[PDB]
């Protein structure tokens, strides 16, 4: 009995906490690990799908791989045992291990508790790499950024400092940093998450009519349905509220639609693991995927298999750093380090944010020329606006 | 039927009573057409061509009804009314008595309710196209339903209940791709049917002539220890489906010429204006035809149910049949030699009947009866077992390093799993050195080439125990 | 106890409206049996048709869980908002879900599957809830439902 195993699948997670920004990416280092920050598991259905399709899964020190069993041909092309030509689904929780991690990976800071972030082979995002993320927005005129967004112009990507009502024609150098060209996350995969029961409101409730609701899954098949009759004491016009029941479905990314009209778009959970972080899905299917993303070609009624590797990557926050002190320091707007601002005679604080590292190459002097020590990752200060807005971001240094 | 107020509720049916088991290491795919076909939201039946072709897991009739439904009628039925009268015309007796000329072959429904009431548990469907009234089967399909079935691991065994309509050359063709499937997965089993004749009644002796016919069939003499076969048919209790204005009607006079009435049995019916008691009478007579399966259907069943009493080592023969009236043939010794033995390896188990016993299960060979290692099914399907439990224990050292420390490791696995066998007498021996060795290393199996390509040789030796099939008694006058 | 009768007589037909209405609201019968008495038929609240609040002894078993959970979290206002008291409140409410698991009010074969808690900086909170001085605590629970129909089937037996 010949057994022949093949890697078919590369799935790495950068970040640059730990790598910082290379002026051209490559590769990862050979010294990189995550192995104590993120982890990537299989669910049960994704289990007993790659036990009928004999795959193997496999963590790694940079994520995770797949092993295809195949058949060693002579042309160097390599089949699968049998034709895989149906559609096929695979998912995988994303969970977090290091505590402190919402303090250096750059997120939203609005109370979001029922969200939830999706990752899929269905992105396009074929740049220097193949992203599982959504492609990030280019910069124009005329509209509202937040402090933290990240932006494209110009071959290069913007990182937002300040808030803007109203941008401008040509980017204003004081709110904008300058890092090379990639992709990273953002709030463009911020889906919202939902559990087994709903609410759902029909506006302009008309007793004479009824009503389908159907739920239809990444491979545009129709998985659930029924039906909902207005009773006939029900003033025509007010909202109508009902409750659904999702009970035996498969977690993962839906569209809830009602007689040819979407009407919600969610990422279906079960709770089987409900600290996860993130869902990561993988589609087979010939139509919906690109020829630059699968993995499978077909030819002379078989199919062989094309390895790939496909990246997620997240951006560190930055922060302005802030030197604060229990005795005076006799250091003065005229003997201390251009690029820092004195705010009184215990304080003082960088003029524009830094970002949070790992071992930081190079750290800050004083007016005596003097090494300062880089902030802790324990605790961040950000500061509310009138309109209750986050304004500025520190970080805190006890000397 | 809806319930809205809370409390008890009371119905009265016509039903059979259901049974229900749990198994694991015989998990069977039924291939063939269904009525319905309706899974969830989805109509695998929706358009003529395209049709969804999927292999569905149920583990009760329920289920299958849920899904599938049930079978078609029949429209052969034919009654006779028998009266015997005076010397002056008056009736002094009448009887009834039903016959079937020529049944469908769609028998899935059927199959099911057999299956089921002879153990069983966790199967596997695959609805290749709707039943249809003509009774077409088409080689295409069943192949594109096996070719699908490839795709499930719980799949162990290989079941074609439609079958026995098709020609000599489709049916060898199709036999022939299963057996292939099972030498290239090398962990299923397929179990046949025996195409008998097809005239009426049965022509004496005909099971010598249906071997002669089964051995000339051409077939991979490879794969041949893959798969077993059964004879002959079996007759059973469950009932026909029909209509009342399908079923023909004749009346026989004082055992007089048999005559054709112009009436149907709907014209009986005593809610058309007919006369009841003689509708009472074809009711009767209908319920009481008996209704002929393959014994494929069953034969899985006892296999589930043996192998969780006994053991998958132990031969699945010499056990009796449920829900069974009687064989549709009588096998003698004589015709046993032949069946059982032939140069050609080819082997048929027979299902004879013994007085007191009911009907029971009579031989336990393969297709290769002649072969010294692969003679009975017993043995190759403990093999297959053993195997692919080796290989689910030994998968998860792929990508590890090739050295010693990987293969300490890796003989430990398999020599527990095989103590564990041993100690259930499954391997004879006295003690675990005398019933299995394990051999895997440099200088065992290996060399520096296989290191450098990255290959692991492991070799693994047994000894089954097999069964005495001949007891033999001598008989004397004691001295005195 | 001490009831003579009952002024009206209901039956099935009606009870068949009482119990169920497109609208949602249902209205619980009291109905005498021959050689019973007179009994309570009937446990649904006014909102019948929801999946989750169908029943009365489930709203009311889930307002004394939480009465409970928050007399038992008061302690901790005022105090540090870090993750020495979140693990603290966390036991706490653990264990009362424990007791609760094991005299039968809710499912499941371990307290693994009857019941989850989450609170903390990855789970439920971000650091503008820590500047605020907000705690977020997520509580599941699976409850047990009751039958409220049966159904039995006759035949005569073959022979």
């Known amino acids: ?399 | 039927s809806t319930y809205k107020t809370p409390g008890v509720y009371i119905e009265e049916i016509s039903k059979f009573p259901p049974s229900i088991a749990q198994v694991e290491t015989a998990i069977p795919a039924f291939i063939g057409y269904t009525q319905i076909a309706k899974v969830g939201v989805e109509n695998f039946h929706t358009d003529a061509d395209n049709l969804i072709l999927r292999p569905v897991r149920i583990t009760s009739l329920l289920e299958y009804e849920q899904f599938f439904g049930k079978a078609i009628n029949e429209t052969t039925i034919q009654v006779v009314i028998q009266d015997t009268t005076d010397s002056r015309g008056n009736l002094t007796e009448r009887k009834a008595s039903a016959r079937i000329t020529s049944p469908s072959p769609h028998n899935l429904y059927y199959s099911m309710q057999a299956y089921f009431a002879n153990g069983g548990g966790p199967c596997y469907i695959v609805s290749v196209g709707p039943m249809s009234n003509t009774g077409t089967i088409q080689l295409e399909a069943l192949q594109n339903g096996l070719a699908e079935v490839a795709k499930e691991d719980e799949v162990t065994l290989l079941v074609f209940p439609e079958s026995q309509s098709l020609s000599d050359e489709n049916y060898a063709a199709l036999m022939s791709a299963a057996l292939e499937q099972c030498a290239n997965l090398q962990d299923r089993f397929t179990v046949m049917d025996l195409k008998l004749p097809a005239t009426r009644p049965i022509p004496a002796n005909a099971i010598v002539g249906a071997s002669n016919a089964f051995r000339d069939l051409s077939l991979p003499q490879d794969n041949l220890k893959y798969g077993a076969c059964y004879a002959p048919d079996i007759e059973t209790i469950f009932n026909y489906f029909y209509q009342e204005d399908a079923v023909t009607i004749f009346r026989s006079v004082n055992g007089g010429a048999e005559e054709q009435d112009t009436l149907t049995m709907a014209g009986y019916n005593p809610a058309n204006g007919g006369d009841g008691i003689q509708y009472a009478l074809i009711e009767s007579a209908i319920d009481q035809l008996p209704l002929i399966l393959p014994p494929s259907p069953l034969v899985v069943g006892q296999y589930a149910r043996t192998d969780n009493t006994r053991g998958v080592w132990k031969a699945p023969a010499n056990v009796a049949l449920s829900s069974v009236i009687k064989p549709v043939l009588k096998i003698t010794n004589e015709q046993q030699n032949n069946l059982n033995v032939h140069p050609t390896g080819k082997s048929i188990n027979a299902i004879r009947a013994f007085t007191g016993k009911g009907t029971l299960i009579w031989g336990a060979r393969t297709l290769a009866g002649n072969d010294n290692e692969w003679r009975y099914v017993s043995v190759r399907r403990f093999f297959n077992m053993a195997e692919e439990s080796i290989k689910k224990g030994s998968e998860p050292f792929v990508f590890e390093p090739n050295d010693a420390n990987t293969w300490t490791k890796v003989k430990a696995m398999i020599e527990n799993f095989l103590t564990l066998q041993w100690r259930a007498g499954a391997l004879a021996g006295a003690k675990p050195e005398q019933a299995f060795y394990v051999k895997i290393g440099l200088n065992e199996t290996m060399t520096a080439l296989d290191i450098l390509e990255g290959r692991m040789i492991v070799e693994i030796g047994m000894a089954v125990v097999r069964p005495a099939e001949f007891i033999i008694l001598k008989f004397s006058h004691k001295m005195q």
């Open chain 1, 1 to 399: 009995m010949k057994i022949l195993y093949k890697k078919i699948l590369n799935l790495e997670l950068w970040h640059d906490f730990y790598l910082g920004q290379p002026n051209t990416p490559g590769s990862l280092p050979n010294n990189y690990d995550i192995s104590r920050t993120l982890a990537l598991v299989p669910t049960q259905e994704c289990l007993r799908v790659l036990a009928n399709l004999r795959w193997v899964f496999r963590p790694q020190l940079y994520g995770a791989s797949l092993f295809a069993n195949v058949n060693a041909a002579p042309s160097g092309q390599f089949p699968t045992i049998f034709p895989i030509d149906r559609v096929y689904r695979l998912t995988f929780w994303l969970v977090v291990s290091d505590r402190y991690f919402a303090n250096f990976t750059n997120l939203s800071l609005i109370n979001s508790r029922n969200q939830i972030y999706y990752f899929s082979n269905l992105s396009g995002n074929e740049g220097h790499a193949l992203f599982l993320t959504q492609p990030l927005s280019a910069y124009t005129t005329n509209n509202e950024y937040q402090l933290g967004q990240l932006v494209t112009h110009a071959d290069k990507t913007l990182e937002s400092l300040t808030y803007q009502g109203n941008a401008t024609n040509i980017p204003n150098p004081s709110d904008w940093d300058s890092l090379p060209a990639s992709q990273y996350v953002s709030e463009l995969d911020h889906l919202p998450r939902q559990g087994t029961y709903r609410t759902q409101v029909i506006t302009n409730a008309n007793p004479d009519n009824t009503y389908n609701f159907t739920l239809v899954n990444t491979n545009e098949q129709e998985s659930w349905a029924i039906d909902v009759i207005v009773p006939d004491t029900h003033k025509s016009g007010e909202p109508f509220s009902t409750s659904l029941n999702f009970v035996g479905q498969t977690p993962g990314h839906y569209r809830l639609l009602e007689n040819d009209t979407q009407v919600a778009e969610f990422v279906l959970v079960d709770n089987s693991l409900p600290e996860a972080f993130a869902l990561v899905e993988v589609i087979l299917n010939p139509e919906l995927v690109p020829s630059a993303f699968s993995l499978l070609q077909a030819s002379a009624g078989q199919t062989f298999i094309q390895p790939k590797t496909y990246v997620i990557r997240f951006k560190n926050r930055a922060t302005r750093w802030r030197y604060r002190y229990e005795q005076p320091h006799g250091c003065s707007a005229a003997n201390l380090p251009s690029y820092f601002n004195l705010i009184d005679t215990h304080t003082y604080a960088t003029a524009r944010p830094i970002g949070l590292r790992q071992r930081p190459d190079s750290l800050l002097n004083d007016c005596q020329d003097r090494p300062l020590p880089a902030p802790s990752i324990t605790l961040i200060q950000p500061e509310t606006d009138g309109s209750q807005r986050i304004a500025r971001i520190f970080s805190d240094i006890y000397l």
